[PDB]
């Protein structure tokens, strides 16, 4: 019916993809074998959206993995839910990218991206009525951030009438795993800026801060927090997929949260979120879902929305649930909260109510949010830049395979103009 | 004391920077402290 | 459970998947959730009155009588009252007691002359075508 | 599926590897019979038809005496027979005689055997050198070896793992010219040389496993145990791996400026064990201690550059963090301005494996630190000034002239390393 | 309280003599 | 329907809220787990006053615990009802304030109340319809007389329209425990005299003093002491939750009782106090409890009213009884005592009765009186204030952290300001 | 999570921490091995299999000390790098033990600190074991304490020094290294408590009935002592006592900071289940002139400040009805500008004897803190028998030997002239 592709680039996007994989498959019964295994007929209506159907009731994801080095591709396939991936989707080279946007790009990547143009042509013939593309992957290495935002170049120039939902895992200042991802960090945005109209930043540091002071989990591995970034992967998409009383797509939320062609950077959310020792004193309702919906805690990306103003927030709804309490409180928190909205527009807040919450639990509320706190998440690379470009240190790397110096001062001239833009309308 | 002590205890050793003598513990290379002291006292 | 043989005072640990406490060492009662009484009620001793003359000491300037008139009756665990297998009113909650360590093994039988603790226990290929070699 | 090479010139390649591949023999499990009692050691083995598993090394040295002790001592029927080539007139403390004369006799076999390794691995990542600067073998042979290796295998990465000499003790007298002569090929024709000195091991040996008086078996042991730590994401699964040249972008900023150090930590016997507590963040900060380091240098003389982390065995990512974060308020510890981000880190699930015999204990826990410093350029100049004290006599020479080598490239030599020190106070200063 | 289509290929596919209130 | 917010701040009044929880869930009829199990609906109409919902049928405290030293925290979860509070409400420090006024409102103390007051905050949006808070601390602590001086000033700042049940627990002549107690009093009664709309005075040694006289007691320890003060803490908000003949809420006792604006520090009192061999000869009647009443020995703190006079008395009632013998009995007792009483004011009396008396007895009755012989109370404080100040002894360490000279001269002042008033309206 | 550190400097800190660590592992259950057959945070860490390891740091510059704890029955309990040792010992010098080997080793000494104090989530104070007239009790102190002081700001800084006594003492050169001990104990130490020979000798031929008592009977009765200030944190009571609020209460100026220490009731076995052991009375033999534990009149000075910390069965009331029995009590003087003067503290642990021992078994005890003015004429004596050392110049070439200057003997003089009228200073009336 509307179709969406799921594209996985790069050791992050691998990770991610194969946890969101999980949950949609668990949210649908789907057993790792590949059949159907459920109590309700509802999750059968709509399931060509994520999956395919094979002969003898096997249902295939409708997923594309690329990764130069072949490392990871045996973790996925020996993980839980690893059975279930098509082995022709499985595309990938011979040597790894070295944390190098360059080999990752134009050297390495440039020939496999062949191989993967054919397996998404391929699969995109297959559906019904495309309804556009999701994708993940990593800024700060080599392969996710190169060839991520290179097959972001290759489908843009050939399916002009659909929308890309980037999911973009973007490094921290103190989490920073990486000691030259300030180059590919500047060179991945002037990619994403122009082909992607809806991305989606995602940090480190906000995930680790809500697993201690939330969750409260003293061991947060990696298969927790790609399970919190899951959680918002199935939420902001659940009224494609289920009955509800107003329905919304990824298009609405794109015409009701990208008012300008480069202001489209968006921040994440998801909370219906507990401790284990604190769930029976808390009473599940619409009032305390709102109430942390929009606090500077539940934030999926390391900056402080306070020291900015919102331009536009969506809010999707899941479960049997009232409609006035929906309305009054999305009412409440502009009225009381005038500060933090911009006032040459109102009606900043979209909601959509959906039918059918998730497995064990009651209702459920996706938060995205455009906001011009971004700034602050731009300024730290500028400067890292700005003060690494300076000396031309780590640069041999480089313009050893085909690239001249004058693409890096493209790269900070696009993005401070993406800075002025935000600062210009706040 | 570990000097009179039985060849087949565990605790025929003495701990890391023990000032005391041990006989035979000078003839002795390559190894560690409390091991070397008790083959020493072997 | 800690039962302290001393006081005959129980206290409570709790094994997080820790300690932390989730008890304190108190005495326990035994039938009902029980009512906080009225303040006084739950004096040691049963006093007629205290000396009529006005210097005295203040501990020993109590007269006792012969009648306890107003008992409540409150009933405490004890070591008698709590053995293995036996379900236990911690406070409102149903606790069952299912095993029991070497040296409170050693003091029932010794004292009660029980011999047996029983320790009570709580708990691929797909299929082939014909193009090609198998 | 992805393999490695490594090459071992000389008398300490050979006597390394001889305490390196029992590691990996070890905890593969794989018999010294050669025989295993899925793909994990595709990295490090090749797999026979009839079972036998067989190295990817080559152990080449111009003296037969320290082969014939691995002929017929325990891994004799490990290696293959043509991967431990030999020779019979030892370089004998000469840069001239193992470059010029006797190299040139075997080392169309060597490039024989290497090619011959190299076309049965269908996927290469890249070569890593096992030698010494003070020996005439590890000087001369790896000099030309890595000229002939750079012409024939171009993109391929190379990484050394040198036996840097000690300030005060050292073994031969001629090494100061030994030393600079076969550092002249390596500012070109290299791009990461790890160093490890001797008497930095000594010092470690001494205050850390208590052992009074250590031998070759304990240095060589933890130097066994370093290029299993850095060769561990490759060989086993993770939270996130690395790739050879991972760790090399995140290292080497400038074509000249390539020259890292090595720690590994914890290091202690197994009586250390039991009473101290092995924390995530303990074992960082014994890294970032000046006294656990195997380079005789002070850091806090030197200026840091970029610093790689691979943690192996039971780690949290979020104790990793929250111990960098502490790393960065200590002001004992400075990073230039120029490069804000310092850090990559690397995850390994596999705990260490100590041999039996050893010296080292249970570790749970362990991590390997690589950090670019420009410390060593207190090492180079002393390295220099006890050079131009022995060359302005013109003493040790005649053989040099005698064996092939024009004299005029003494001061070539010098004018390279020179504008080295130039380089390291250039990149050192701010603006 | 206080007091207490099935498949795609099937669907598009296999209609041969069923309609579509068959299947 | 009414909201009232908790909080509990320092060692004395951490232990006095647990004792206060545990017997409002008693006469509620709540379960240690917070579970409803009881007999009558009429202790459910008004349970929200107290308690909030929970999904599944649990009912949870509305009350913030805090203290400099997780210590207290630990034996408070350790308590025979430490489950029902929320974990999330479970805020501390980690440096003990050591018996410091310094270290608990100005150094170490200002990095806790950003933390403080959100969950504080949070639980008043949360509500619909707030009606004012209640503080249990103790004056001559260094968590307690700091940070409760400092949380009533941030919330007096932001709540203006609210009203402030501060249950101080005051320094005793005799039974001091700490050679710093005329520091850290003067220090509080500066805070406490401005942004406190009444605060109820609480000593210990008139609490001994009934435990054996009245009660007769042979071992009075403190977990039998502080229910004294959990029962009058219970008895003041009675018609809040329960119905009556003659409803009183706490903005009707604020109204009759403060006829100035820096006179209401009042004596609290208990009527049914009876020891334990006299339960079955005594006649439990209204002339009875008022004899009980206006005893000098069944006052809750050390001041004797045959020193001073009464500005106004106030009296609530719980069980069944009748208008006229209250009446009657409680203007008998103003003609007696027509000395003590001021001639200034009419009609220095005012009762509240309820209907649903406390379980466990046919009645009982909660005494309050705002009277002058509250100012010995403070001038012995002074007194001791002076004799230290003079030799500037442990002055070092307030000054050796922020404080200076100066404050302590301005304290020493409010508190001969608020004692000057007392023995103006005397004669 | 609120820990304390312990320092054991000096043969006589680390004797009486081997009572101290026996009474600690005998407290606790935890068995001299190191395991098992929460309050052991703060003087104890967990390892992952279950071992229990001591925060003590064992440093002396003569090994023959530290030497038979490696070897002695306690030698699983402790780290075997936290036990520090030197090469030659100060030999009652304090020019040895502070400028001329003191420095060889203070490195060490440092990074175990810091090693031991990073473990810590929380620190409350620093516990440090030493004598005055010793050459390592004072040189070795002296270059500790104004390291620590410059390294750590805050923190509390508790210290049990072992006082030369009036008439008795061992060695020679005691009347100088108890002088130059002081110019550090003024300035950087937060509260030194404070103990003689003497007076625990005394006490070991009345109460105990010892004819010929050993230093063993004398760590096990200053172990009872410092295992009962140390009590409220572990095991919790009616009202507990931080290390912060026990020093605030109890030093009312910056340079009057020395205590005496008192504990009740010590009897021995036969005596003590004739005798009744109540509250009212192990209080009253506190303030006995011939208990206390340092050997001075309490009768001449007035008291300034007093901590009674109770441990075991006691109820609230007895003590208050205690205390104003004391006060109406003609001999107990008070200074007049402090009204009250009295900190109580209990607690909910009886006592524990050691097996072997003489302390009986008894239900409650109380441990008696008292800053007094009597000390005074304690140090009067001590400084008199500086001046005839001073005088003839006699033993002074062993410190100018080693490259110290003589200038020091009269600035620490003026500073002990500084302390003692300090005293009559604050004694006065008002
Ligand atoms: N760390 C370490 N160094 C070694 C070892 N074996 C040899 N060496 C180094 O080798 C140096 C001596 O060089 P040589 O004796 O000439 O041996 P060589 O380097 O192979 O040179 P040739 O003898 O000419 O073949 C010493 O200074 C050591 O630093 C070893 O097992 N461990
Ligand atoms: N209470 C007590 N005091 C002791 C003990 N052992 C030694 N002392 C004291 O130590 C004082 C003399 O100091 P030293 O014997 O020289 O020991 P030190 O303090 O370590 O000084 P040096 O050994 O010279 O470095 C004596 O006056 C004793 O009071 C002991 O076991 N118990
Ligand atoms: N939150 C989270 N981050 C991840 C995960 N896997 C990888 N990353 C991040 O990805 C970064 C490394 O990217 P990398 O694998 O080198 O990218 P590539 O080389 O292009 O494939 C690190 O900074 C990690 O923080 C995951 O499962 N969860
Ligand atoms: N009634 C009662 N009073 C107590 C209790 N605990 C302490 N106190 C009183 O509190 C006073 C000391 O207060 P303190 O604990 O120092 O206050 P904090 O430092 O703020 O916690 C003493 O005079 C005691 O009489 C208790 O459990 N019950
Ligand atoms: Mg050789
Ligand atoms: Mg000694």
Redesign the interface.
């Known amino acids: 019916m509307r179709e969406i592709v799921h594209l996985q680039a790069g050791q992050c996007g691998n990770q991610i993809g194969a946890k969101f994989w999980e949950v949609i498959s668990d949210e649908h019964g789907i057993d790792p074998t590949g059949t159907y295994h459920g109590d309700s007929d509802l999750q059968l209506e709509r399931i060509n959206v994520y999956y395919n159907e094979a002969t003898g009731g096997k249902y295939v994801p409708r997923a594309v993995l690329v990764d130069l080095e072949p490392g990871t591709m045996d973790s996925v396939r020996s993980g839980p839910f690893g059975q279930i991936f098509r082995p022709d989707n499985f595309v990938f080279g011979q040597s790894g990218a070295g944390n190098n946007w360059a080999k990752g790009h134009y050297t390495e990547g440039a020939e496999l991206v062949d191989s993967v143009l054919d397996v998404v042509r391929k699969e995109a013939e297959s559906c019904d009525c495309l309804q556009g593309f999701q994708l993940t992957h990593s800024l700060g290495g080599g392969t996710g951030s190169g060839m991520g935002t290179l097959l972001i170049s290759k489908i843009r120039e050939e399916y002009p009438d659909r929308i890309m939902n980037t999911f973009s895992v973007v490094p921290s200042p103190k989490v920073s795993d990486t000691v030259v991802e300030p180059y590919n960090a500047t060179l991945s945005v002037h990619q994403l800026v122009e082909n992607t109209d809806e991305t989606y930043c995602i940090d480190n540091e906000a995930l680790y801060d809500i697993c201690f002071r939330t969750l409260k989990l003293t061991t947060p591995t990696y298969g927790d927090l790609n399970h919190l970034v899951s959680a918002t992967m199935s939420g902001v998409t659940t009224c494609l997929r289920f009955p509800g009383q107003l329905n919304a797509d990824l298009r609405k939320l794109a015409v009701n949260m990208v008012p300008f062609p480069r202001l489209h950077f968006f921040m994440p959310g998801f909370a219906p979120l507990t401790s284990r020792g604190s769930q029976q004193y808390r009473a599940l309702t619409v009032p305390e879902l709102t109430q942390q919906m929009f606090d500077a805690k539940n934030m999926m990306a390391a900056c402080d929305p306070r020291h900015g103003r919102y331009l536009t927030v969506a809010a999707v709804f899941r479960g049997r649930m009232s409609m006035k309490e929906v309305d009054e409180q999305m009412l409440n928190v502009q009225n009381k909260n005038s500060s933090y909205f911009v006032e040459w527009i109102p009606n900043n807040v979209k909601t959509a109510v959906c039918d059918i919450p998730p497995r064990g639990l009651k209702m459920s509320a996706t938060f995205i949010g455009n906001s011009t706190a971004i700034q602050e998440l731009f300024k730290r690379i500028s400067e890292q830049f700005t003060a690494m470009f300076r000396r031309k240190a780590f640069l041999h790397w480089y313009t050893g395979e085909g690239m001249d110096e004058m693409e890096f001062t493209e790269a900070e001239s696009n993005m401070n103009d993406l800075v002025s833009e935000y600062q210009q309308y706040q | 004391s570990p000097y009179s002590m039985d060849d087949r205890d565990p605790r025929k050793f003495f701990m890391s920077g023990f000032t005391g003598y041990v006989p035979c513990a000078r003839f002795l290379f390559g190894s560690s402290f409390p091991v070397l002291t008790n083959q020493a006292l072997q | 459970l800690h039962y302290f043989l001393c006081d005959d005072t129980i206290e409570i640990k709790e094994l997080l998947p820790a300690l932390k406490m989730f008890l304190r060492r108190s005495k326990l009662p035994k039938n009902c959730p029980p009512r906080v009484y009225q303040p006084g009620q739950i004096t040691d001793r049963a006093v007629l009155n205290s000396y009529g003359d006005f210097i005295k000491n203040q501990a020993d300037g109590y007269l006792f009588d012969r009648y306890k008139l107003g008992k409540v009756d409150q009933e405490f665990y004890k070591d008698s009252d709590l053995s293995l297998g036996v379900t236990i009113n911690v406070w409102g909650r149903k606790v069952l007691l299912y095993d029991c360590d070497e040296f409170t093994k050693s003091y029932y039988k010794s004292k009660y002359g029980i011999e047996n603790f029983t320790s009570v226990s709580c708990k691929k290929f797909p299929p082939y075508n014909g193009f090609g070699s198998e | 599926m992805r393999e490695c090479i490594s090459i071992h010139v000389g008398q300490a390649g050979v006597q390394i590897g001889n305490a390196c591949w029992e590691l990996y023999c070890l905890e593969h499990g794989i018999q010294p019979d050669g025989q295993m009692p899925d793909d994990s050691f595709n990295t490090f083995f090749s797999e026979t038809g009839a079972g036998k598993h067989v190295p990817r090394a080559v152990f080449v040295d111009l003296e037969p005496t320290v082969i014939d002790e691995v002929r017929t001592g325990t891994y004799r029927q490990l290696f293959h027979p043509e991967q431990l080539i030999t020779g019979k007139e030892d370089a004998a403390n000469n840069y001239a005689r193992g470059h010029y004369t006797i190299g040139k006799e075997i080392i169309d076999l060597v490039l024989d055997r290497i090619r011959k390794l190299a076309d049965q691995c269908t996927g290469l990542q890249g070569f890593l050198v096992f030698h010494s600067f003070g020996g005439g073998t590890g000087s001369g042979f790896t000099s030309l070896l890595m000229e002939r290796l750079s012409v024939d295998y171009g993109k391929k990465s190379k990484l050394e793992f040198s036996i840097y000499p000690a300030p005060q003790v050292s073994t031969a007298v001629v090494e100061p010219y030994n030393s600079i002569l076969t550092t002249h090929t390596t500012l070109e024709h290299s791009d990461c040389a790890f160093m490890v000195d001797n008497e930095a091991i000594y010092d470690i040996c001494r205050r850390n496993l208590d052992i009074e008086r250590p031998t070759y078996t304990n240095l060589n042991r933890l130097i066994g145990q370093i290029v299993s730590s850095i060769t561990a994401s490759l060989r086993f699964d993770g939270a996130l791996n690395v790739d050879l040249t991972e760790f090399q972008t995140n290292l080497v900023p400038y074509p000249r400026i390539h020259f890292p150090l090595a720690t590994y930590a914890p290091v202690i016997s197994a009586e250390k064990a039991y009473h101290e507590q092995l924390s995530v963040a303990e074992i960082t900060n014994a890294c970032f201690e000046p006294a656990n380091q195997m380079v005789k240098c002070d850091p806090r003389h030197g200026k840091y550059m970029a610093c790689c982390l691979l943690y192996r065995g039971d780690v949290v990512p979020k104790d990793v963090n929250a111990a960098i974060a502490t790393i960065k308020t200590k002001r004992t510890i400075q990073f230039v301005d120029w490069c804000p981000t310092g850090f990559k880190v690397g995850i390994n699930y596999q705990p260490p494996t100590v041999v039996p015999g050893g010296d080292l204990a249970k570790v749970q826990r362990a991590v390997c630190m690589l950090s670019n410093t420009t410390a060593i350029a207190e090492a180079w100049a002393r390295l220099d000034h006890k050079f131009d004290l022995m060359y302005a006599k013109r003493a040790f020479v005649h053989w040099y002239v005698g064996e092939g080598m024009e004299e005029g490239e003494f001061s070539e030599a010098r004018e390279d390393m020179a504008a080295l020190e130039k380089d390291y106070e250039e990149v050192g200063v701010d603006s | 309280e ?1 007091g207490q289509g ?5 669907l598009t596919h296999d209609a041969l003599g069923l309609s579509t209130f068959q299947k």
């Open positions: 206080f099935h498949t795609f290929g099937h």
